[PDB]
Amino acid sequence: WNSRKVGVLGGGQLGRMLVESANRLNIQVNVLDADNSPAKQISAHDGHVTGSFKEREAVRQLAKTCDVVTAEIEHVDTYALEEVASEVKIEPSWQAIRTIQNKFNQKEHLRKYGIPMAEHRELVENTPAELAKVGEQLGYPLMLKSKTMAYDGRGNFRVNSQDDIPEALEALKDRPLYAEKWAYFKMELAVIVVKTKDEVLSYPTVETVQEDSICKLVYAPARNVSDAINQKAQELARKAVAAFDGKGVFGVEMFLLEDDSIMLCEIASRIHNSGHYTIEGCALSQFDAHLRAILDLPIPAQSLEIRQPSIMLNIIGGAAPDTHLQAAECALSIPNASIHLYSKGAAKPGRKMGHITVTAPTMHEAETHIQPLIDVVDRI
Amino acid sequence: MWNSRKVGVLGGGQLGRMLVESANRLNIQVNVLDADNSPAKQISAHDGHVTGSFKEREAVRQLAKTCDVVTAEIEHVDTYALEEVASEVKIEPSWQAIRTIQNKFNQKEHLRKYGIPMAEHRELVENTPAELAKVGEQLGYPLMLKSKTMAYDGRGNFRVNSQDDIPEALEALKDRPLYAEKWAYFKMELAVIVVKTKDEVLSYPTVETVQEDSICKLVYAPARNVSDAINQKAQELARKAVAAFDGKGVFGVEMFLLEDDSIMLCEIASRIHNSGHYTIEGCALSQFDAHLRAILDLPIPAQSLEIRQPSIMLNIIGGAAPDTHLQAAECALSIPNASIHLYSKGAAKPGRKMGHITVTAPTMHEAETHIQPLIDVVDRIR
Ligand SMILES: Nc1ncnc2c1ncn2[C@@H]1O[C@H](COP(=O)(O)OP(=O)(O)OP(=O)(O)O)[C@@H](O)[C@H]1O
Ligand SMILES: Nc1ncnc2c1ncn2[C@@H]1O[C@H](COP(=O)(O)OP(=O)(O)OP(=O)(O)O)[C@@H](O)[C@H]1O
Ligand SMILES: [Mg+2]
Ligand SMILES: [Mg+2]
Ligand SMILES: [Mg+2]
Ligand SMILES: [Mg+2]
């Protein structure tokens, strides 16, 4: 069962956690990324392919040596993937990844399936006049969005008023964009879905908190949220994921609106930051679940249940190249703190350097244990 | 710079591997001393590892020259090279400790003065039936004939039902230093994992262990059906045993619970032990996380070794077939809340510890129910 070889496009922390799981199962993983990547570092064998998963020919080498190829990002060359689909299984599917990696197309496909979402207008002209018109239809503020290559919200620009139109466009020059109606959410939610060969399952709904457009915190499960909203959100995520072909873990972002209704923010065709808490909080982490789904191995549902309330805090670079080691050093003394350093090295501000996951029998207790670290992070 | 230190591990097996697993999470470098491609090395792709044996003087010397601290994943190492190197590298736990622990007759003779309860025993100065018998005549039958040295998985012990048994005994444990212990009729076996640090002595809760063909099979944590009085008594015994040795690190203590509720020591392991594998999922800080911090003087918050939910651990022991462990692993895939750990040792040999499965649940009763089918399976295959 475990003699197959899994190829992973990307060798960052996501790829790494993934390799932690395969290692557990003695399943070989061949990472395609820079030599030395966080993920090649815990997997000492010769099967790895050095290069970019944006580069056609490497992806080609990866493929020809693997039984299944998967990705640890949604910005991979799905055309290069399309080429080898003859040679190797690809999961999830490259069409699904293709639709998904372009934020506008993902939304329009989803619309066919009736998924609650924020209204938007594709921007064909990229002229301040075109945008003014949208503004009139959608109102301010508006969230100007890049369709592709999007992450950490570096390709998004909040347009508060007709007057920011120029800064917005200068900000997001040379890209296809769409403008989306503003989501007045009271909380951001996320659900990790496991799409298998036969079913679509999900972990419980959690609460995500981004600072500076970057994920800073996750509370699992979501604080002050009725089991119903929880289910609803889950139920929604599963349905949105089902509109895709292929297997594996999908990260689903959502918005909790003031009336407690739910809208989809965006889907990620791969294991995702919101789910790192499953390492310590559930029987099978999303990494475990991903491997299993793409190789058709059983996935008991109770294994995706949350064992104890957990709170995950990302370690993000600050200006000083050690800060991440500062957060971690502090972490060493937080009770019930589980520390994950990414072995990326020296920090660049805003880079994801590691994460700390804290558990306790109750959320309150967990919040109490981690505050001091949260504090340290804020201050420094 | 706390995690910039380098850790040398004498031994690259499953235990060292799990140690590496912890070091990896803290991004701490570990230089493994063992054969190329050993389990621990496989998840550690750097060029610092040492190729050779933990029983080998110079290899041990070489490794030492390469790190800040040397620790071990096994008891059977050259404590004479470590003594040679003590002025060059910190070694934790102490080489003297491992030196004493590695010889079981010496370990127990050391503990006798610290007043630890244990079985009566007699060293065998000659491995002559003539000798074994007079011994037979001193502690009665049946008795456990045991090699003081290179012991594991009972691969060095023989139960001696009686005199007719003798010759077999000697032949099985031929050309080894031996000792003989009076039989211990326990009503159950228990173990406590202890951690010695620069300023404290911590411990995990007591668990119930179950051996089969003298190899550890399962672990129930905490121990089922043991009064509160018993766990304390157990915790104390263990901690008392540990205290008789110097060094920082994790130690495992195996005890016997007798019919009358008294506990006697079975053996103490100078390092991470099978009894604690459940800590990976049962606690915030695993025994492996604990060991690394202890030896590096890093904080170990106490609440981090408290158990989160009941758990049961089961070892995947090889059988006649060298792929059966995959069969157990494979059945595990379907057990609810079962976390599979496979060691990457290759084809199985009989009795080899191939990997382990850990199942947790809000209650032991539920953990047991989940696990049963897996047990049923492993047993079929025995
Ligand atoms: N219409 C909107 N209204 C309000 N807030 C929005 C809107 N779109 C985005 N946001 C805020 O922007 C954040 C980042 O948006 P998004 O997830 O769409 O960007 P990204 O670059 O895709 O991020 P990621 O790092 O997750 O790939 C959201 O998590 C939410 O906080
Ligand atoms: N006197 C004794 N009476 C009865 N059983 C005994 C006795 N000594 C050992 N055993 C049985 O043998 C089991 C394994 O023996 P022991 O730990 O001494 O050997 P070992 O080779 O050191 O094994 P390991 O290091 O793998 O634990 C004990 O757990 C116990 O159940
Ligand atoms: Mg995104
Ligand atoms: Mg997002
Ligand atoms: Mg032993
Ligand atoms: Mg033992």
Residues A10 and A99 in one domain: yes
Extract the annotated binding site of B for ATP.
104, 146, 153-154, 157, 181-182, 184, 189
Helix, strand or coil, per DSSP, at residue B147 = strand
Tell how far CA B248 is from the center of its chain.
16
Tell me, yes or no, whether A192 and A228 share the same domain: yes
Torsion over CA: B229, B231, B232, B233 (sign): positive
Phi, psi (degrees; rounded to nearest 5) at A368: -65, -50
Minimum Cα–Cα distance from B305: chain A residue: A336
B301/A336 touch (CB, cutoff 8 Å), yes or no: yes
Residues B210 and B317 in one domain: yes
CA-closest candidate to residue A342, choices A1, A19, A8: A19
Pairing mode, strands A120-123 and A49-50: unpaired
The pair of three-digit structure tokens given for residue A192, joined into one six-digit string: 């990790």
Q: Choose, out of A4, A24, A29, the residue to mutate when testing the contact with B (most B CBs < 10 Å).
A: A24
Q: Kindly give the distance from the C-alpha atom of residue B322 to the centroid of ligand 6, in angstroms, as a whole number.
A: 24
Same domain, A100 and A143: no
Record: contact A283-B24, CB cut-off 8 A: no
Shared domain for B216 and B331, answered yes or no, is yes
- Alpha-carbon distance of A18 to B162, in angstroms, equals 55
Chain A residue numbers with beta carbons less than 8 Å from the beta carbon of B41 are 44
| Nearest C-alpha neighbor of A281 from the set B275, B355, B337, B332 | B337
CATH of the domain at B176: 3.30.1490.20
CATH number for the domain harbouring residue A201: 3.30.470.20
**Do B244 and A298 meet the contact criterion of CB atoms below 8 Å apart?**
no
Domain boundary among A159, A181, A203: A181
Say how many Å lie between the CA of residue B266 and the centre of ligand 2.
Answer: 7
H helices present in chain B, as ranges:
14-25, 57-65, 79-85, 95-101, 104-113, 129-139, 166-172, 228-243, 279-282, 287-295, 324-332, 364-381
Assign B50 to helix, strand or coil: strand
Q: Does residue A35 contact residue A97 with C-beta atoms inside 8 Å?
A: no
Using CA coordinates, name the residue in chain A closest to B346: A26
Say if CB B316 and CB A24 are below 8 A apart.
no
From residue A355, give the alpha-carbon distance in Å to each of A82, A225, A328, B28. 34, 24, 9, 16
3-state secondary structure of B93: coil
Q: Whose CA is nearest to atom 17 of ligand 2?
A: B267
Q: Give the Å distances, CA to CA, from B185 to B47, B58, B225.
A: 49, 44, 18
Contact call for residues A336 and A284 (beta carbons, < 8 A): no
Q: Are B33 and B54 in contact (CB under 8 A)?
A: yes
DSSP character for B246? Answer: -
Token pair listed for A293: 């789904």
Q: How far is CA A23 from CA A20, A117, A182, in A?
A: 5, 39, 43
Report which of A264, A335, A299 is spatially closest to residue A108, judged by C-alpha positions. A264
B240 in Cβ contact with B86 (< 8 Å): no
Question: How is residue A241 written in tokens?
Answer: 């994921």
For residue A177, the tally of other CB atoms under 10 A from its CB is 27
Q: Between helices B287-295 and B14-25, what is the axis angle to 10°? A: 70
Residues in Cβ contact with A162 at an 8 Å cutoff, skipping those fewer than 6 apart: A132, A135, A140
Give residue B334's domain range: 183-380
**How many residues are listed for chain A in this entry?**
380
A181 assigned ligand-binding residue: yes
Q: Are B314 and B213 in a shared domain?
A: yes
Domain count, chain B: 3
B215 plus B364 within the same structural domain: yes
Residues A363 and A223: beta-carbon distance below 8 Å: yes
Cβ pair B39, B101 in contact under 8 A:
no
The Cα A75–Cα A47 span in angstroms is 23
Q: Report the SS3 class of residue B274.
A: helix
CA distances from A301 to A189, B148, B302, B370 (A): 21, 48, 32, 13
Which residues, including other chains, have CB under 8 Å from residue A378's CB and lie 6 or more apart? none
The helix/strand/coil state of A251 is: strand
- What does the buried/exposed string (b/e) look like for A242-259 if buried means 16 or more CB atoms within 10 Å of the residue's CB? ebbebbbbbbbbbbbbee
What are A71's strand-pairing partners? A9
Single residue among B83, B112, B141 that ends a domain in this structure = B112
- Report chain B residues whose CB lies below 8 A from the CB of A303: 336-338
Which CATH number goes with the domain that contains A48?
Answer: 3.40.50.20
Nearest Cα of chain B lies from the Cα of A306 at a distance, in angstroms, of: 11
Q: Do B44 and A42 touch (CB under 8 A)?
A: yes
Q: ∠ at Cα B60 (B51, B350), nearest 5°?
A: 60
| Most informative mutation of B267, B271, B356 for ligand 2 (most atoms within 8 A of CB) | B267
| Judgement on whether residues B253 and B352 belong to the same structural domain of the protein | yes
Residue B33 Cα to ligand 3 middle (Å): 44
**From chain B, which residues contact A within 8 Å (Cβ)?**
1-3, 21, 24-27, 41-46, 284, 293, 298-299, 301-304, 308-309, 326, 329-330, 333-344, 355, 360
How many whole angstroms from B4 Cα to the centroid of ligand 3? 34
Residue A63 CB-half CA count within 13 A: 22
- Interatomic CA distance for residues B341 and A20, integer angstroms: 11
A246 to chain B, closest Cα gap in Å: 21
Answer yes or no: do A267 and A372 share one domain: yes
State the Rg of chain B over Cα: 20
Cα maximum dimension of chain A: 60
Residue B161 near residue B140, CB atoms below 8 Å:
no
Q: Find residue B31's DSSP bridge partners.
A: B8
Instruction: Say which DSSP state B336 is in.
Output: T
A interface mutation test: which of B197, B281, B333, B360 has the most A CBs within 10 A? B333
Same domain, A220 and A285: yes
Q: What is the β-pairing status of strands A49-50 and A29-33? A: parallel
Q: How far apart are CA B327 and CA B334, in angstroms?
A: 12
* A338 with B299: Cβ contact below 8 A: no
- Whether residue B41 is found in the same domain as residue B163: no
Q: Which residue has the tokens 């959320």?
A: A363
- The distance from CA A158 to its chain's CA centroid, rounded to whole angstroms, is 21
Per DSSP, the three-state class of A238 is helix
Query: Distance, in angstroms, between B46 CA and closest chain A CA?
Result: 7
Resolution in A: 2.1
Name the token pair of A101.
């990696």
| Residue in B closest to A2 by C-alpha | B326
> B192 with B322, same domain?
yes
Distance CA B287, CA B290 (A): 5
Q: Which residue, among A149, A151, A20, has the nearest Cα to A77 in the 3D structure? A: A149
Q: Kindly give the distance from the C-alpha atom of residue B256 to the centroid of ligand 2, in angstroms, as a whole number.
A: 10
**CA B57 to CA A16: how far, in whole Å?**
36
Ligand 2, atom 16, residue with closest C-alpha: B154
Q: Which of A48, A282, A332 to mutate to test the interface with B (most CBs of B within 10 A)?
A: A332
Single residue among A92, A111, A130 that ends a domain in this structure: A111
Q: Which two tokens stand for residue A290?
A: 């991903």
Report d(CA B358, CA B281) in Å as an integer.
8
DSSP A330-376: HHTTSTTEEEEE----S--TT-EEEEEEEE-SSHHHHHHHHHHHHHH
Helix-helix angle B364-381:B324-332, to 10 degrees: 150
Exposed/middle/buried for residue B276 (C-beta within 10 Å: 0-12, 13-18, 19+): buried
